């Protein structure tokens with residue numbers, strides 16, 4: 001039927017069976033269509049913010065004759081869902097900052113029991129910080145690459161926020177991923193090894209620059225980051 005990318009395929013696998021899912025900023029409503037068609041989800045909501053992506057999602061769902069189980073809605077983030085409407089929420093193809101913003105702006109729509117499957121393009125840390133604060137528990141993480149690009153997928157549900165971080169510092173865990181850190185797969189090492197190298201270059205770059213209170217502060221943070229990364233790729 002519909003084919004999904006490795007990235008969204010990964011996301012779909014965490015959808016609880018018979019779950020009603022809400023895909024925020026749904027890409028053509030493919031993921032939700034795919035989930036409902038494969039009976040992974042019982043029903044779904046596909047949220048779009050702009051007119052274009054909205055009409056096109058509505059048309060695909062209509063074209064696919066999935067209007068009966070899929071509701072394409074227009075709105076900002078979780079603005080499209082009603083409290084206790086969905087059992088799983090997927091937010092992918094966005095930056096960690098946005099995802100965290102979406103979650104925070106619409107946490108009124110959350111009961112807390114909904115399973116969150118978040119796929120940040122970058123700065124997954126913003127999501128972990130938000131999750132820890134709203135006490136959620138990370139139940140799993142995956143990091144893979146597709147078409148020469150690495151992508152992370154975070155899965156969370158109500159639970160004990162510290163559990164997943166047992167054995168690792170919140171500081172590091174939140175940045176690289178507690179589960180990811182334990183796994184230490186090729187994609188993970190490559191991503192963070194490069195990040196560290198990039199951090200060192202800025203450190204040495206700022207090092208040669210002026211000796212100002214500002215640059216020394218900027219260096220302190222780079223150092224903290226470097227040591228942090230060093231501890232995760234040992």
Ligand code: NI
Nearest residue numbers: 096097123126
């Ligand atoms: Ni960020």
